[PDB]
A paper describes a structure:
Two immunoglobulin (Ig)-like subdomains comprise GG-[name], each having the conserved residues of a canonical E-box motif and internal isopeptide bonds formed between either lysine and asparagine or lysine and aspartate residues. Our findings show that the GG-[name] structure has certain features in common with other pathogen-derived pilin-proteins, such as the Ig-like CnaB-type folds and the presence of internal isopeptide bonds6940.
Whereas the tetragonal crystals had diffracted to 2.0 Å and 1.6 Å resolution at home and synchrotron sources, respectively, the orthorhombic crystals showed diffraction to 2.0 Å resolution at both sources. In parallel, we solved the crystal structure of the tetragonal form with an advanced molecular replacement program using search models from distant homologs. Refined models for the tetragonal and orthorhombic crystals (residues 176–298) gave Rwork/Rfree values of 13.9%/15.8% and 21.6%/24.9%, respectively. However, the electron density for the residues belonging to the extended C-terminal tail was not observed, with proteolytic removal as the likely reason.
Numbering used by the authors: 176 to 298
The structure:
Amino acid sequence: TTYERTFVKKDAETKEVLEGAGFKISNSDGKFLKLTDKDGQSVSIGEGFIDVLANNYRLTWVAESDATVFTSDKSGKFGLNGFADNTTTYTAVETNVPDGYDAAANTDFKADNSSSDILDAPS
């Protein structure tokens, strides 16, 4: 059994869904998520939810500068599956902020198969 997490990026005031908000995910060790293929090679992802399972990708933990950026799609959605447990705490860190917004505060989460909103304050 594996777990997933979804987020929806929204304007804090209007709740408009925001596209193109980019996030890195950190763990308690202060390392950041980098997806690889089964053979350790880098992969290209687009916006939205990433089906790690269907792609047989692997989760690895690297310096922030080397991490995968996960990006909200046109509906504001992003996330991934392939997490090993629902008990570990991670942090979603906004690194690429849409125009007209201030970054959301970092968001602690567990891979608990839920969806939650991440709010960007309009500038």
